[PDB]
Amino acid sequence: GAHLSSPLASIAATNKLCQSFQTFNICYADTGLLGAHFVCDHMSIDDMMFVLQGQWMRLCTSATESEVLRGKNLLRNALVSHLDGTTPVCEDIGRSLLTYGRRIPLAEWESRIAEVDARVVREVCSKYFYDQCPAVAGFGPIEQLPDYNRIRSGMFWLRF
Amino acid sequence: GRQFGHLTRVRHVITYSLSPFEQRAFPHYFSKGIPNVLRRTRACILRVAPPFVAFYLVYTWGTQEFEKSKRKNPAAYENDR
């Protein structure tokens, strides 16, 4: 419903600005991909966006350690969660080997979790978000979707 | 009505563009542009100038026509009588 903690899941259920969306991460060998994928009404497109830039941008500055925790716990859960079952256990190794080698730094991941900090996330996101050049993919009936030049100016806040 | 939403209906068009940073403010603006200036300038100058001629002609035509008509009183009637 509308009482969820995620501002998006709060608004996107509230005014149903989208049908649904989810965010992805894909990190290649040398590369990584951060962004979301959403579906919204042909008249509802803009408003999804002007929201979505809100969240990333506000993180880079005004974020807070409280909400860090609720994020922190989840990822611990999701981490521990996926680890059940023969195949997934089996499956980590292969990529991990091809990725980090043997490393299955299981308990370390936890230690790794303890590393993250408020400044960290801000300082990290400051790099990879604030004033950057985003990529835009689209599939019709797009037309509402604003021109790039908006999105671009829309990446960096003016402080508002 | 709502300006961007409902205007037309269009399908199976595709569009490609880049960040403005990715590219240059003057991709051969001088060299490549100058011909484009020239080629189209004639399509107009065909249909542009011809009247401008006419005035300037008449302008001077009347000017002279005006001058001697006025300028010289003892022109046709000279001052013998």
Biggest pleated sheet of chain B:
none
The greatest inter-chain interface is formed by: A-B, 9 and 11 residues
As a percent range, the share of helical residues of chain A equals 55-70%
Distance between the termini of chain A: 29 Å
Number of folding domains of chain B?
1
Kindly give the count of domains of chain A: 1
Question: Helix count of chain A, per DSSP?
Answer: 7
- Order of H and E elements of chain A: HEEHHHHHH
Q: Write the H/E string of chain B, N to C.
A: H
Give a structural overview:
The structure is cut from a larger assembly and holds chains A (160 residues) and B (81 residues). Chain A is built from 7 helices and 2 strands; from the N terminus they run αββαααααα. A two-stranded antiparallel ribbon of chain A has the order 1-2. In chain A, strand 1 (20-27) and strand 2 (32-39) form a beta hairpin. In chain A, helix 2 (45-62) packs across helix 6 (118-128). Chain A has 160 residues and is mainly α. Chain A has a single domain (1-156), classed as Cytochrome Bc1 Complex, Chain A, domain 1 (2-Layer Sandwich), CATH 3.30.830.10. Chain B is mainly alpha-helical and 81 residues long. Chain B has a single domain, classed as Single alpha-helices involved in coiled-coils or other helix-helix interfaces (Up-down Bundle). Chain B has one helix at 29-71. Chain B is elongated, with a radius of gyration of 30 Å. Chains A and B meet through helix 7 of A and loops of B. Chain A: It comes from Bos taurus. Chain A: Belongs to the peptidase M16 family. UQCRC1/QCR1 subfamily. Chain A: Component of the ubiquinol-cytochrome c oxidoreductase, a multisubunit transmembrane complex that is part of the mitochondrial electron transport chain which drives oxidative phosphorylation.
Question: Quick recap of the structure?
Answer:
This is part of a larger assembly, with chains A (160 residues) and B (81 residues). Chain A is mainly alpha-helical and 160 residues long. Chain A has 7 helices and 2 strands.
